[PDB]
């Protein structure tokens, strides 16, 4: 409907809105060999858990995470991870949250272990960006 449209305020659009533009700070500030060594060791020690780096997407105006480096059970679902991150950023239930891994939204029925197997990087970490709508 017309009421659903916006033609009065300017909407700013830029490459900040392209999730493919995301750059994880963790990969800038920590050298590859240190990341790889730590991820390799943690996966050997806890084969039923996956190491995950979570950072906020460029455009997003929602809350920040106090911690970015997580160890997650492989059997945790994407929906459960959404819920747990939502609580950590204090995002009210009424507002949408999105995850992106390698520029795609995860499949609904994926577990964190399935996401890890398909998308982990050569440093043994899985990188997840989170954003608002």
Numbering used by the authors: -20 to 112
Give me lines lifted from the publication on this model:
Autophagy-related 8 (ATG8) proteins play a central role in autophagosome formation and selective delivery of cytoplasmic cargo to lysosomes by recruiting autophagy adaptors and receptors. The LC3-interacting region (LIR) docking site (LDS) of ATG8 proteins binds to LIR motifs present in autophagy adaptors and receptors. A genome wide siRNA screen identified the short coiled-coil protein (SCOC) as a novel positive regulator of starvation induced autophagy.
The SCOC LIR:GABARAP complex structure revealed a large surface of interactions between SCOC residues 6 to 19 and GABARAP. The SCOC core LIR motif displayed the canonical LIR interactions comprising the hydrophobic residues F14SCOC (Θ0) and I17SCOC (Γ3) deeply bound to HP1 and HP2, and three hydrogen bonds formed between the main chains of the SCOC LIR residues T15SCOC (X1) and I17SCOC (Γ3) and the main chains of the GABARAP residues K48GAB and L50GAB. On top of these canonical LIR interactions additional specific contacts were observed between the SCOC core LIR motif as well as the adjacent N- and C-terminal regions and GABARAP. In the region N-terminal to the SCOC core LIR motif we observed: a salt bridge between K6SCOC (X−8) and E8GAB, two hydrogen bonds between the backbone of E10SCOC (X−4) and the mainchain of D45/K47GAB, one hydrogen bond between the sidechain of D11SCOC (X−3) and the imidazole ring of H9GAB, and another hydrogen bond between the carbonyl of S12SCOC (X−2) and K48GAB sidechain. Within the core LIR motif, N16SCOC in position X2 was hydrogen bonded with the guanidinium of R28GAB. In the C-terminal region, hydrophobic interactions were observed between L19SCOC in position X5 and the edge of HP2 (L55/L63GAB). In summary, SCOC LIR domain binding to GABARAP is stabilized not only by core LIR residues but also by multiple interactions involving residues of the N- and C-terminal regions flanking the LIR motif, which range from residues in position X−8 to X+5.
